[PDB]
Amino acid sequence: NDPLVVNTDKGRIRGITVDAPSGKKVDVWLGIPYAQPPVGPLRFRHPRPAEKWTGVLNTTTPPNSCVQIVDTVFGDFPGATMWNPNTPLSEDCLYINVVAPRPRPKNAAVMLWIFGGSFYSGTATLDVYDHRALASEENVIVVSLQYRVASLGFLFLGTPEAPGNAGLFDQNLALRWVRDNIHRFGGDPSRVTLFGESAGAVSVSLHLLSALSRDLFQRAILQSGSPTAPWALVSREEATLRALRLAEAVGCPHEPSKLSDAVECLRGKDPHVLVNNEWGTLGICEFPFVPVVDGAFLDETPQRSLASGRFKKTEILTGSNTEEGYYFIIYYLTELLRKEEGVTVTREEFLQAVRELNPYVNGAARQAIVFEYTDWTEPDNPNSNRDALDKMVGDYHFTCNVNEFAQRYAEEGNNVYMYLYTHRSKGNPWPRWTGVMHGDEINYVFGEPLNPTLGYTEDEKDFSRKIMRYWSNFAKTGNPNPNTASSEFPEWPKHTAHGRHYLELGLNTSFVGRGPRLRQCAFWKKYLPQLVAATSN
Amino acid sequence: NDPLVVNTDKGRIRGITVDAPSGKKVDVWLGIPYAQPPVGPLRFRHPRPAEKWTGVLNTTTPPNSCVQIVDTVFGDFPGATMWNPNTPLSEDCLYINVVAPRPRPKNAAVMLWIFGGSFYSGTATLDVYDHRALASEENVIVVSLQYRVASLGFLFLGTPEAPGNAGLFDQNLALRWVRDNIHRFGGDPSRVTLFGESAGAVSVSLHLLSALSRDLFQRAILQSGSPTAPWALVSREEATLRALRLAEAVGCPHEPSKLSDAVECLRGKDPHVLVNNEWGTLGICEFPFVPVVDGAFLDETPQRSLASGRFKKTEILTGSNTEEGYYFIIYYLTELLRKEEGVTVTREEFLQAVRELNPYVNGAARQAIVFEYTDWTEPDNPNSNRDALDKMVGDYHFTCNVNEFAQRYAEEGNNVYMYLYTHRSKGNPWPRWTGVMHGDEINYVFGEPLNPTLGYTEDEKDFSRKIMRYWSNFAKTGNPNPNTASSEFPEWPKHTAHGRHYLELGLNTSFVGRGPRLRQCAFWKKYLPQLVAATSN
Ligand SMILES: *[C@@H]1O[C@H](CO)[C@@H](O)[C@H](O)[C@H]1NC(C)=O
Ligand SMILES: *[C@@H]1O[C@H](CO)[C@@H](O)[C@H](O)[C@H]1NC(C)=O
Ligand SMILES: *[C@@H]1O[C@H](CO)[C@@H](O)[C@H](O)[C@H]1NC(C)=O
Ligand SMILES: [Cl-]
């Protein structure tokens, strides 16, 4: 009997034994199909499941990446190219990857990765997401999936041939494949933990809401993303306009009254032409094609689900990084924050940035933001004014939404674990002033420091082992803490509805705090909305 | 020859030798007259100098106190009775006290005290101000003066017979007396340091502005008071109305057109009847009869003098206590902050208090205050909501005005030293939650802990020695620091215009910080004014 041949519910498949960078060995199945290719008449539409096949399908090659724009802003800068697709771009992209430890488990916990990329970019095949270290060091099945992104994943016109959320129905279908099949690979299908970062975290949080995903997994890890983030969803009316603008931009009919003509033309366009024409006039952290409230995957806004307690009763682990804003500002204010060492911002530049980064609020709101984000010890300090820019973008679009979601989960009686990630890698290629940006924790979550061909210190390797152990303890039990309390493994306390404790994740630290950033988050969530209402006659 | 008989420019006077509680001896001259009694036709008017006398005037008895209301809200509670007049009340109250060390110096520095009491109360004769410890431990001439308070000191109608600021002209005349005479008591008239607390500090600061006082002293110490405090001055237009309201309240004519009838009737009323009818409907930290801009003592608002650099160029030492607001709230919101142990404030009680304590601002401003003064770690915590009431009253009426004054003095090149006083006496008679209140430092400045019959600990005795040494180093040299830096005497750095360092004064501490409370002071001084402007249609 060939332990690498597996009889899935649609056919037999053959995997392959390979080495993790550490030397430990894992079994691997790459590019398992879970849907019909979403091509031709099927573009923009929800996935159909895969047709049965005869024989043995060799599932040993990393799959196609879904069509998306490629980032060339900084040339071959490694900090940017690590997020670009590393396999051929194709609409034929609906595949899953399974990576199992050796020897093969019987009922192991299953960690299912959903990649981020602001819903317009990303792929499960990235080297930074390599599954071999995590599976082999922690004894879990690691699963990853492709899902459609950008307008191919999220075009919405409010018609059956453009119903929205195709990329989310892709993820749901993959979740169903995992529950139907993962036991054949040594995983317990009742022990699936979803984890994802940024738009992948938003995606995970939406599976905590949807009635269609409710029974498809056990618990969730949400790295720097939450469904109350203002970029996370778009209204149905605005999505419809954005789709029609895309149709115009590529030469298609775009009349609100004859939506059939517009969809049909869009289905005939080259896919690269579509994703390369999506980017109109949008503010920072506004992405053109994102989830909507459609009626079937979600039938109410996330804020209404949270207010009413309509979400899955389970544990969650979630957290933020210290410099969440810079990554997005570096690409948006390219004259102000050049990607050079020693950048600073003058007071007059900061005041101009506040208007550009908050383009929708009135005069009174901007002053409040200025007051809230000024260092009153030294108002004109050019470092303080640069850091203020990161914090106001990072608080509003990231940190404060994670806090909000973790709060509601905790108020409703669920165990919550909250982190603030503060480690900057010794080999970080970005300018020193960028600090700990969006996504930096991913390398450590997937155990990349254990790769002996890379430059990580021994301290960083221990750190990555600590983090993988927290993450996988949580998947295995719902609690990141070990049984025997360690010197290397600090205690990670629950984030209670009233304590709101969080654990700082870093090299030489076990600091537990509150929040984080409760005051700035109250500014955005409580003070500023009532001031906008008061001054909008 | 009798060294206790001194020939002043108006006559001879006889003093008396007494003991310090310190064990050392001092010479003392109490009740030296410096003006004609301001009685009869002279009521409300500026002082005339004292008429010459033959013989030897026995100056050995603490002088009369100026007429003022007596506080009975808490009966014989020691925390309150220590501020009540301890000598008979009379309009015949314009006297000075001099206390010299033994053996008598030749050209000693002179520390001249101006009592506080919100311009309606106070007296130089209080036991808490007793001069003997400071004079004998620090080898300085200690001087104190009476000045008229309440409507008797500060009635203004804009006519020659109610010209305003009589109490400040009293202080000016006393300052003159000191420069004409203090060398006969062993003091250098070119080395007068003014010091005062609360309305006494305001008074000191107004002598730093007035052209009539400019050459009458060398430097200044300002404890918890500044001329930018919103209670420190009243407009000429409002002063006139308040005076006319007082006339009405006591049955006098009060027609805005016939001011002579009103003044002449007021000159006939009993002085106690006058001061007991002053208290109309006023907010917290609003006192009816206070300085005005008259044309002669001051001819522009303090803020206009500060902005234009028209103020005396000299060193200043100044500071705040940590709970500046509670004292006034305890007397204003007597149902909410009962003088009992274990008081707390509910969230709903706090929101009502914000409206009562900031009764002039609109809805938007109140929300900003609420947001600024909420503990966002635990918004509903009833200790936090009680402390917030102290901080919003103390910041707005005290701490932030001291900061502003020290800031402007530093920007103009003068040496400034800033303290935050944080010591609560072990024997404090107020409830524990009141913290370190307005006026608490006065006992330590005057060396009261060195009286062994009071209950002070040994550490508190040391603290008082340290503080008298800082204060008198400052009077002697312009710098509170000693020459040989000690472990008992930390370094007190200058408060520079951009560093804004302060020294925390307390038992087990040498902490240096910035501000204090730069962010909250920016809220009152920069943010809230621009938000009121924006929302005032
Ligand atoms: C798959 O692998 C086997 C060898 O292990 C090979 O003989 C076969 O041709 C491969 N391709 C397909 C399509 O099965
Ligand atoms: C003043 O004191 C002297 C000596 O102590 C005494 O003889 C004299 O009577 C006193 N004068 C008055 C007016 O009491
Ligand atoms: C003074 O502060 C130090 C700092 O921890 C402390 O160890 C010491 O006990 C303190 N002394 C007191 C509070 O009397
Ligand atoms: Cl001047």
From Swiss-Prot, chains A, B:
Q: List the disulfide bonds.
A: 66-93, 252-265, 400-521
Which compartments is it annotated to reside in? Synapse
Catalytic reaction equation(s) = acetylcholine + H2O = choline + acetate + H(+)
Question: What keywords is this UniProt entry annotated with?
Answer: Disulfide bond, Glycoprotein, Hydrolase, Neurotransmitter degradation, Serine esterase, Signal, Synapse
Active site at which residues? 198 (acyl-ester intermediate), 324 (charge relay system), 438 (charge relay system)
Q: Give the record's GO biological process terms.
A: acetylcholine catabolic process; choline metabolic process
| One GO cellular component term noted in the UniProt record for this chain | synapse
Location, primary (coarse class): other
Which EC numbers characterise this protein's activity in its record? 3.1.1.7
Q: Which residues have a glycan attached per UniProt?
A: 58, 508
GO MF, one annotated term? acetylcholinesterase activity
What function does the entry list? Answer: Rapidly hydrolyzes choline released into the synapse.
Q: Return the similarity comment.
A: Belongs to the type-B carboxylesterase/lipase family.
Protein known as: Acetylcholinesterase
What is the species of this protein?
A: Anopheles gambiae
Q: Which residues of the full protein are shown?
A: 163 to 699 of 737
